[PDB]
């Protein structure tokens with residue numbers, strides 16, 4: 001294991017609302033760049049790098065998309081784990097060093113709809129459960145797949161339609177990253193009933209940070225992700 | 241056996257905005273209050289059942305289990321009461337306004353000293369309200385007396401370890417005391433494998449002319465078997481089995 | 482007297498089975514002393530109504546005792562609201578299917 | 579390279595175990611590439627904070643490598659917000675208790 005000495009962190013005393021009550025986890029360990037650190041605190045991975053605790057300044061995520069699976073995921077500090085991906089890693093350069101931001105060429109719905117037509121900015125976020133895109137564009141995407149508004153930018157799709165939905169392809173670094181309908185939908189269950197949640201949420205990210213699409217757990221789960229601080233790049237490979 | 245209420249007018253729901261009805265275990269609602277509050281002045285099921293003389297006694301009663309594991313979860317008796325689900329004798333209160341099942345509440349006493357509804361107030365007996373409901377300012381004062389903290393939307397949580405040392409809360413109706421122990425007025429809730437204790441009292445003001453009103457919800461009916469009598473316009477209570 | 486068994490979901494929802502129509506179409510309902518209308522989801526519910534997707538729906542075409550009405554209704558509770566139209570039929574307690 | 583196992587809750591929350599302090603006090607955290615701060619609940623959380631009743635809490639008094647800071651912080655995500663104060667200590671990945 002690793003021991004990161006003299007790390008500055010927050011002792012939370014107030015958590016208003018219900019946000020953190022049901023959450024399975026105790027806290028958050030941020031892994032983005034120092035630029036967005038509240039109080040300009042040196043982040044864990046930055047301290048880890050300055051202390052030379054790993055030979056390679058990269059970290060990687062495997063996220064399982066089956067909640068029954070063992071393990072539920074794996075973070076590799078200082079390397080990648082070939083047991084959780086197939087083929088080779090394809091890299092994209094970080095375009096702004098704050099979030100792990102990359103250039104998104106376009107978003108294609110197999111039935112015809114094109115979003116982010118002339119290219120846009122996107123972030124790779126393990127802490128966002130869903131794919132997030134601009135309100136108006138996500139509204140168009142949801143109409144193309146027959147999804148209906150639920151609440152707060154989220155949409156539901158009749159479960160019987162999922163098998164016949166078009167695949168959605170994200171073009172990054174000139175390559176297509178396809179999400180099949182099983183990949184972009186989530187099966188949700190409450191009080192002995194089941195529903196299918198759209199894995200795309202509409203939310204506008206205001207400037208100066210936004211507009212931004214967010215490649216959340218839905219995307220990372222299908223594509224094993226490498227975060228490289230040595231070369232300021234993000235790598236993707238098909239997850240095992 | 242059963243009952244068949246002929247020519248009943250009911251609603252075919254086509255729109256249900258928001259998330260309210262999505263998670264609900266039930267498909268619909270069958271209202272059992274008075275015709276006065278019926279939307280579109282529709283003759284309610286029990287009124288139609290009475291007009292058709294399908295029962296001998298124009299009364300209906302509820303047993304509600306407070307243990308979710310128990311079989312049955314509850315029992316509605318149409319045209320009677322069921323002595324297997326109550327002990328002792330029924331005590332009756334006159335309905336004060338025939339719209340909801342409204343009765344006069346003499347006062348609310350917290351064992352530790354606090355008195356709410358000091359000079360008497362109006363209350364309704366509602367099987368469709370999960371919790372006890374009272375005015376925001378008075379419930380806020382009750383929650384402070386039991387060490388509960390605000391959750392969201394008028395609801396409060398109590399540290400589970402404090403429940404055993406909480407005072408009893410007594411509702412005075414028809415000159416008699418109806419005690420709710422901390423076990424009766426708290427609900428054990430588990431979300432993502434985590435155990436929290438919800439206070440069974442919710443603060444919400446119901447605007448006049450209908451309000452102010454306290455609501456004796458499932459928390460109360462669960463401890464006190466309830467009889468709704470349309471023949472004499474009264475509500476009966478007995479200790480639940 | 483007629484007994485109607487109820488189910489208990491989390492000490493929050495108490496409901497039982499009823500029938501509407503000839504032959505009876507079964508529905509679970511909260512017998513609610515705080516309101517006065519009976520309603521169930523319609524087979525004609527709007528696509529936008531997610532709750533309808535996973536609840537039983539009344540089909541007037543399958544009932545020989547269905548009498549058309551069609552008058553609009555809107556019901557609001559403390560919790561939320563709903564709308565639709567009125568119909569007339571036989572209500573069975575319990576379902577008796 | 580150091581592997582850190584993660585748990586998956588409903589394809590929505592991915593989290594692993596870390597340690598803070600000497601000896602390490604174990605916490606579960608989301609390793610979050612969309613933010614840059616580390617935080618855990620404090621043993622000094624306010625009574626009003628219901629989330630901290632059922633989550634692990636850091637106790638600075640039990641750590642020999644705890645270094646007082648005390649500067650206030652306020653973090654806003656998209657989901658919601660939180661506040662507290664800063665502290666300094668050794669962070670272990672995995673917990674290594």
Ligand SMILES: COc1ccc(CNC(=O)[C@@H](Cc2ccccc2)NC(=N)NC(=O)Cc2ccc(OC)c(OC)c2)cc1OC
Nearest residue numbers: 260264366368369444445446493494513515516558559560
């Ligand atoms: C002033 O605001 C508030 C006032 C009062 C309340 C709580 N009490 C009610 O709302 C009563 C009506 C009432 C309103 C006003 C005064 C006296 C009675 N409700 C009912 N009797 N029946 C239903 O609601 C049907 C129903 C629907 C959905 C259900 O779960 C998904 C459900 O599960 C059991 C039952 C909340 C407020 O706001 C939070």
Ligand SMILES: COc1ccc(CNC(=O)[C@@H](Cc2ccccc2)NC(=N)NC(=O)Cc2ccc(OC)c(OC)c2)cc1OC
Nearest residue numbers: 019023125127128203204205590591610612613655656657
């Ligand atoms: C503009 O409005 C919205 C904008 C965006 C979002 C969704 N995305 C985020 O909020 C990102 C931050 C971000 C904000 C803006 C731009 C780029 C990144 N969040 C995180 N990376 N991390 C966390 O939030 C920690 C956390 C906390 C609690 C959790 O469960 C209870 C949890 O479970 C996994 C994780 C929602 C909005 O509103 C709904």
Ligand SMILES: *[C@@H]1O[C@H](CO)[C@@H](O[C@@H]2O[C@H](CO)[C@@H](O)[C@H](O)[C@H]2NC(C)=O)[C@H](O)[C@H]1NC(C)=O
Nearest residue numbers: 008038039040041042646647648649664665666
């Ligand atoms: C408490 O921790 C904060 C961390 O934010 C310390 O202040 C930072 O110090 C670093 C260099 O060590 C700077 O790059 C940051 O800009 C500083 N942040 C702020 C907001 O000023 C701070 O010195 C520590 N000590 C005390 C007593 O507060």
Ligand SMILES: *[C@@H]1O[C@H](CO)[C@@H](O[C@@H]2O[C@H](CO)[C@@H](O)[C@H](O)[C@H]2NC(C)=O)[C@H](O)[C@H]1NC(C)=O
Nearest residue numbers: 249279280281282283549550551552567568569
């Ligand atoms: C549809 O049903 C409504 C509701 O039951 C009927 O109108 C009500 O009729 C009763 C007497 O039968 C009156 O006491 C109510 O005041 C009436 N309500 C309203 C809002 O007018 C109505 O006649 C039925 N028929 C049609 C075709 O709408």
Ligand SMILES: *[C@@H]1O[C@H](CO)[C@@H](O)[C@H](O)[C@H]1NC(C)=O
Nearest residue numbers: 091092093094173231232233
């Ligand atoms: C990515 O960045 C490296 C180093 O800054 C540079 O050599 C390379 O050409 C960049 N790639 C693209 C596609 O711009």
